[PDB]
Write an enzyme that holds these catalytic residues in place. Structure first.
Site, PDB file in Angstrom:
ATOM      1  N   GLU B 121      -8.670   4.249   0.635  1.00 54.23           N
ATOM      2  CA  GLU B 121      -7.510   3.865   1.481  1.00 54.23           C
ATOM      3  C   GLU B 121      -6.565   4.699   1.477  1.00 54.23           C
ATOM      4  O   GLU B 121      -5.835   4.770   2.376  1.00 54.23           O
ATOM      5  CB  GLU B 121      -7.249   2.367   1.178  1.00 54.23           C
ATOM      6  CG  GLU B 121      -5.946   2.005   0.275  1.00 54.23           C
ATOM      7  CD  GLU B 121      -5.409   0.727   0.243  1.00 54.23           C
ATOM      8  OE1 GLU B 121      -3.987   0.567   0.746  1.00 54.23           O
ATOM      9  OE2 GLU B 121      -5.951  -0.155   0.086  1.00 54.23           O
ATOM     10  N   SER B 178       2.698   1.092  -1.432  1.00 52.51           N
ATOM     11  CA  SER B 178       1.982   1.937  -2.141  1.00 52.51           C
ATOM     12  C   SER B 178       2.998   3.314  -2.050  1.00 52.51           C
ATOM     13  O   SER B 178       3.311   3.717  -0.885  1.00 52.51           O
ATOM     14  CB  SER B 178       0.558   2.366  -1.895  1.00 52.51           C
ATOM     15  OG  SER B 178      -0.342   1.335  -2.334  1.00 52.51           O
ATOM     16  N   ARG B 190      -1.370   8.466  -6.520  1.00 49.18           N
ATOM     17  CA  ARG B 190      -0.560   7.210  -6.442  1.00 49.18           C
ATOM     18  C   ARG B 190       0.613   7.019  -7.483  1.00 49.18           C
ATOM     19  O   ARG B 190      -0.130   6.917  -8.515  1.00 49.18           O
ATOM     20  CB  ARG B 190      -1.418   5.993  -6.101  1.00 49.18           C
ATOM     21  CG  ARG B 190      -0.675   4.764  -5.834  1.00 49.18           C
ATOM     22  CD  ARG B 190      -1.765   3.485  -5.897  1.00 49.18           C
ATOM     23  NE  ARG B 190      -1.075   2.319  -5.413  1.00 49.18           N
ATOM     24  CZ  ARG B 190      -0.432   1.501  -5.770  1.00 49.18           C
ATOM     25  NH1 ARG B 190      -0.131   1.475  -7.132  1.00 49.18           N
ATOM     26  NH2 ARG B 190       0.076   0.404  -5.103  1.00 49.18           N
TER      27      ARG B 190
HETATM   28  N1  LIG Z   1       1.475  -8.480  14.524  1.00 53.53           N
HETATM   29  C1  LIG Z   1       1.804  -8.469  13.231  1.00 53.53           C
HETATM   30  N2  LIG Z   1       1.184  -9.581  12.243  1.00 53.53           N
HETATM   31  C2  LIG Z   1       1.488  -9.479  11.115  1.00 53.53           C
HETATM   32  N3  LIG Z   1       2.186  -8.631  10.348  1.00 53.53           N
HETATM   33  C3  LIG Z   1       2.594  -7.621  11.286  1.00 53.53           C
HETATM   34  C4  LIG Z   1       2.464  -7.667  12.498  1.00 53.53           C
HETATM   35  N4  LIG Z   1       3.066  -6.427  12.980  1.00 53.53           N
HETATM   36  C5  LIG Z   1       3.909  -6.121  11.821  1.00 53.53           C
HETATM   37  N5  LIG Z   1       3.399  -6.768  10.803  1.00 53.53           N
HETATM   38  C6  LIG Z   1       3.871  -6.166   9.267  1.00 53.53           C
HETATM   39  O1  LIG Z   1       2.948  -5.432   9.063  1.00 53.53           O
HETATM   40  C7  LIG Z   1       2.652  -5.768   7.739  1.00 53.53           C
HETATM   41  C8  LIG Z   1       1.508  -5.266   7.553  1.00 53.53           C
HETATM   42  O2  LIG Z   1       1.312  -3.642   7.503  1.00 53.53           O
HETATM   43  P1  LIG Z   1       0.096  -2.956   7.249  1.00 53.53           P
HETATM   44  O3  LIG Z   1       0.093  -1.529   7.042  1.00 53.53           O
HETATM   45  O4  LIG Z   1      -1.037  -3.225   8.591  1.00 53.53           O
HETATM   46  O5  LIG Z   1      -0.581  -3.729   5.914  1.00 53.53           O
HETATM   47  P2  LIG Z   1      -2.048  -4.018   5.586  1.00 53.53           P
HETATM   48  O6  LIG Z   1      -2.894  -2.835   5.613  1.00 53.53           O
HETATM   49  O7  LIG Z   1      -2.751  -5.282   6.343  1.00 53.53           O
HETATM   50  N6  LIG Z   1      -2.043  -4.485   3.999  1.00 53.53           N
HETATM   51  P3  LIG Z   1      -2.742  -3.590   2.562  1.00 53.53           P
HETATM   52  O8  LIG Z   1      -3.869  -4.098   2.289  1.00 53.53           O
HETATM   53  O9  LIG Z   1      -1.494  -3.908   1.340  1.00 53.53           O
HETATM   54  O10 LIG Z   1      -2.427  -2.024   2.830  1.00 53.53           O
HETATM   55  C9  LIG Z   1       2.707  -7.209   7.663  1.00 53.53           C
HETATM   56  O11 LIG Z   1       3.187  -7.565   6.205  1.00 53.53           O
HETATM   57  C10 LIG Z   1       4.352  -7.431   8.227  1.00 53.53           C
HETATM   58  O12 LIG Z   1       5.331  -7.058   7.781  1.00 53.53           O
HETATM   59  N1  LIG Z   2       7.531  -3.567 -16.337  1.00 50.55           N
HETATM   60  C1  LIG Z   2       7.077  -3.464 -15.541  1.00 50.55           C
HETATM   61  C2  LIG Z   2       6.094  -3.402 -14.240  1.00 50.55           C
HETATM   62  C3  LIG Z   2       5.810  -4.669 -13.574  1.00 50.55           C
HETATM   63  C4  LIG Z   2       4.906  -4.508 -12.445  1.00 50.55           C
HETATM   64  C5  LIG Z   2       4.546  -3.221 -11.927  1.00 50.55           C
HETATM   65  N2  LIG Z   2       3.993  -2.912 -10.960  1.00 50.55           N
HETATM   66  C6  LIG Z   2       3.584  -1.571 -10.501  1.00 50.55           C
HETATM   67  C7  LIG Z   2       2.039  -1.576  -9.628  1.00 50.55           C
HETATM   68  N3  LIG Z   2       1.846  -2.635  -9.181  1.00 50.55           N
HETATM   69  C8  LIG Z   2       1.456  -2.202  -7.303  1.00 50.55           C
HETATM   70  O1  LIG Z   2       1.296  -1.158  -7.219  1.00 50.55           O
HETATM   71  C9  LIG Z   2       1.433  -3.604  -6.559  1.00 50.55           C
HETATM   72  C10 LIG Z   2       0.422  -3.121  -5.389  1.00 50.55           C
HETATM   73  C11 LIG Z   2      -0.714  -3.225  -5.703  1.00 50.55           C
HETATM   74  C12 LIG Z   2      -1.851  -2.863  -4.559  1.00 50.55           C
HETATM   75  C13 LIG Z   2      -1.211  -2.472  -3.190  1.00 50.55           C
HETATM   76  C14 LIG Z   2      -2.153  -2.419  -2.137  1.00 50.55           C
HETATM   77  C15 LIG Z   2      -3.537  -1.385  -2.210  1.00 50.55           C
HETATM   78  C16 LIG Z   2      -3.704  -2.962  -1.815  1.00 50.55           C
HETATM   79  C17 LIG Z   2       0.175  -2.461  -2.922  1.00 50.55           C
HETATM   80  C18 LIG Z   2       0.894  -2.759  -4.114  1.00 50.55           C
HETATM   81  C19 LIG Z   2       2.400  -3.994  -9.276  1.00 50.55           C
HETATM   82  C20 LIG Z   2       3.840  -3.936  -9.731  1.00 50.55           C
HETATM   83  N4  LIG Z   2       5.101  -1.904 -12.767  1.00 50.55           N
HETATM   84  N5  LIG Z   2       5.914  -2.181 -13.893  1.00 50.55           N
HETATM   85 MG   LIG Z   3      -3.089  -0.891   4.594  1.00 53.43          MG
END
Ligand SMILES: Nc1ncnc2c1ncn2[C@@H]1O[C@H](COP(=O)(O)OP(=O)(O)NP(=O)(O)O)[C@@H](O)[C@H]1O
Ligand SMILES: N#Cc1ccc(N2CCN(C(=O)Cc3ccc(C4CC4)cc3)CC2)nn1
Ligand SMILES: [Mg+2]
Ligand SMILES: Nc1ncnc2c1ncn2[C@@H]1O[C@H](COP(=O)(O)OP(=O)(O)NP(=O)(O)O)[C@@H](O)[C@H]1O
Ligand SMILES: N#Cc1ccc(N2CCN(C(=O)Cc3ccc(C4CC4)cc3)CC2)nn1
Ligand SMILES: [Mg+2]
Lengths: 352, 352
Positions: B121, B178, B190
């Site tokens: 991703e 991220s 990352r």
């Molecule tokens: N129509 C919508 N429905 C839901 N969320 C929305 C919408 N438009 C914007 N958002 C926002 O966009 C965010 C999702 O962003 P997006 O980049 O699409 O994440 P995702 O890829 O589905 N999640 P991840 O698995 O963490 O990468 C949501 O958490 C909301 O804050």
């Molecule tokens: N003390 C201390 C301490 C406590 C927590 C901490 N974290 C850093 C690492 N983390 C993340 O990346 C969260 C995350 C995971 C996946 C995704 C997306 C791919 C689907 C987005 C975001 C969790 C919080 N780091 N340090």
């Molecule tokens: Mg995403």
């Protein structure tokens, strides 16, 4: 004058009081009655009014300070009740720190002939922390860590030596969070801060659960399951995200499962309290981790009253800091964690 | 087969579709009817079912891709509705990324003879971002910043050149966050992530206000005053905290004024929505700032759908990153910010 130091925070007032125990027969005679009344009031009560508390377990006994022997007492009450405190006073040199030393300066001056000396809230912190560790906690270590924090069957509180305390990252979790880098006894700076602190925990918990106190919020959190509210890595991937070493149990989105109406309708208050605690605690740990890496400091000590009677957050910080730093950072804790500013203010008394 | 790339996130599915526009007379004849029906369905509708949307304004027109000319379309729908999508498909090579490429792999294989190729991703993100910037947005800049973000009478969107894009800090705000450090087209990592992302905004907003959609949450936030919920530096100090350069308007404790029952009873839903937005946006900015300083990168580009139709958060990030970095960091934004993973997945098609 009695020897006080005061730290007036956004939420709590912390007071350190030195009770002399080497009063001679002649000194007792010259003791003015208002002063004897204060000393008796403070030492014969552990609750003051409806909201003041003496933390008796923290008392330092038979401390030598300013050439006298005495007991050092630790007292707290809500900043909202400072008017009561000042009104009691109106019915002497005050060394005061915290934002309230500035905000309420004019109010303290309503006490006739009172001399208010404002001291900086992070300077006092560093001085108080170093002082208390140096004198020890009645012969025991002031500083401790959680050994084997990743294994619950092994995890236990153990003492940590700070006889050479530098460098040190100090994470002060009060209403918000201040992060300090301490390089020597006279060389320290505020690296940054975060707004997601103890006031966020308490304020969000109160909005989400209707809890009426910090202690009730912690009680609810101890019964809850934060994963009912949080979206985990395994909720998004079905398992670990192997490529970047993210375990399936890691939180991907705090409160992220609350975007679904049916999940909002099934979540309990206790779950929400625990999710609030986990969200705030993990963010504090992560910010501390990033600051420690940038400052090239591997000892991270957490202070402030967010962690009082809060073993959940302490253990979460100990585990998370160790896990996410791959064992490069160590979480440290202090028995007198909320009172260092008040002590540092008291230690400024000889300068006036 | 039609040329798709799919990014199945925790919240939204993003689809990039390449519509050929150089179809010859002979090619049209050999067009199988199911395929003509897909192309007609996708290009003659902008809403698909009840929850699918084509973002027509983002279409890249007359793009040359894989030796053919066509239009690149950008489509999104909730991950919760992926079963509908797969059911439509059951009534060809799919390059898929996001956590859902793993979580739903078995579901995609219910489409007979479908070949699912899972791509990472964050790899897809970097490739898609670099590709779209390179081909431009129909001759206009893909990347932009807010000029003079500190002065509202001057603040305006302006193009930014990324012809040498390295190094770059990429902050992907989806359900969580991220943070990537991109040193070259093949050297990126990352750095870290935070759990306080778009899902936290939407989930907390829904709990606190009863809003029923992202757009409604933003509408409420646009009317609110976050300082009704937040405790500011001036609430604690009475003014600036001069010693450490903290302005009185800075947030000291997010939701920190909600520890007072009377303030909880007067705060509006709109105030709470705005405080939720400000809390999440400032935390993302602060974490990005700390990562940029540690990685020695001064260009910070924010992507992901938290910022779609969200000028409030974009302007807050532009202002905050500039203010708190003393002008050393620059906040950058991308017109196709939620779709780079889907594009990067499509670009993997020649490898299969
Ligand atoms: N129509 C919508 N429905 C839901 N969320 C929305 C919408 N438009 C914007 N958002 C926002 O966009 C965010 C999702 O962003 P997006 O980049 O699409 O994440 P995702 O890829 O589905 N999640 P991840 O698995 O963490 O990468 C949501 O958490 C909301 O804050
Ligand atoms: N003390 C201390 C301490 C406590 C927590 C901490 N974290 C850093 C690492 N983390 C993340 O990346 C969260 C995350 C995971 C996946 C995704 C997306 C791919 C689907 C987005 C975001 C969790 C919080 N780091 N340090
Ligand atoms: Mg995403
Ligand atoms: N009895 C209590 N009442 C209120 N909050 C409590 C109490 N016990 C613990 N807390 C927690 O302790 C935090 C306050 O910590 P403290 O270090 O005293 O901050 P403060 O000095 O008043 N604020 P600041 O101005 O930001 O330094 C609160 O936000 C709560 O999370
Ligand atoms: N982009 C971007 C970005 C956005 C925000 C940001 N902040 C870093 C600075 N800050 C704080 O210190 C908050 C705070 C202030 C006072 C106190 C206490 C002394 C009473 C504790 C905590 C605010 C957040 N940094 N970068
Ligand atoms: Mg304090």
């Amino acid at each position: 004058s009695p020897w006080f130091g005061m730290d007036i925070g956004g939420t709590l007032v912390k007071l350190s009081y030195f009770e002399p125990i080497d009063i001679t027969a002649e000194e007792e005679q010259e003791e003015v009655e208002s002063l004897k009344s204060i000393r008796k009031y403070l030492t014969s009560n552990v609750a003051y009014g409806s909201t003041g508390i003496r933390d008796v377990h923290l008392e330092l006994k038979d401390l030598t300070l300013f050439g006298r022997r005495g007991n050092l007492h630790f007292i707290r009450f809500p900043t909202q009740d400072l008017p009561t405190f000042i009104q009691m006073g109106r019915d002497t040199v005050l060394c005061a720190t915290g934002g309230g030393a500035y905000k309420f300066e004019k109010d303290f001056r309503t006490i006739g002939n009172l001399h208010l000396h404002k001291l900086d809230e992070l300077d006092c912190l560093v001085k108080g922390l170093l002082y208390i560790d140096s004198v020890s906690f009645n012969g025991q270590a002031e500083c401790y860590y959680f050994a084997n924090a990743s294994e619950p069957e092994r995890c236990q509180k153990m003492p940590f030596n700070l006889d050479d305390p530098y460098p040190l990252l100090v994470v002060n979790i009060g209403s918000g969070v201040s992060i300090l880098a301490v390089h020597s006894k006279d060389n320290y700076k505020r690296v940054t801060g975060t707004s997601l602190g103890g006031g966020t925990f308490l304020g969000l918990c109160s909005l989400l659960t209707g809890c009426e106190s910090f202690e009730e919020a912690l009680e609810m959190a101890s019964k809850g399951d934060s994963t009912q509210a949080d979206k985990l890595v395994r909720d998004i991937y079905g398992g670990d995200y192997e490529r970047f070493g993210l375990p399936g149990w890691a939180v991907a989105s705090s409160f992220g499962n609350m975007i679904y109406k049916e999940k909002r309708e099934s979540v309990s208050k206790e779950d929400l309290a625990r999710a609030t605690l986990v969200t705030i605690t993990n963010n504090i740990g992560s910010v501390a981790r990033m600051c420690a890496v940038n400052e090239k400091i591997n000892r991270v000590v957490f202070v402030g009253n967010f962690l009082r009677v809060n073993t959940l957050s302490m253990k979460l910080l100990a585990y998370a800091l160790d896990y996410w730093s791959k064992g490069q950072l160590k979480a440290l804790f202090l028995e007198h964690e909320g009172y260092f500013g008040a002590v540092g203010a008291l230690l400024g008394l000889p300068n006036f």
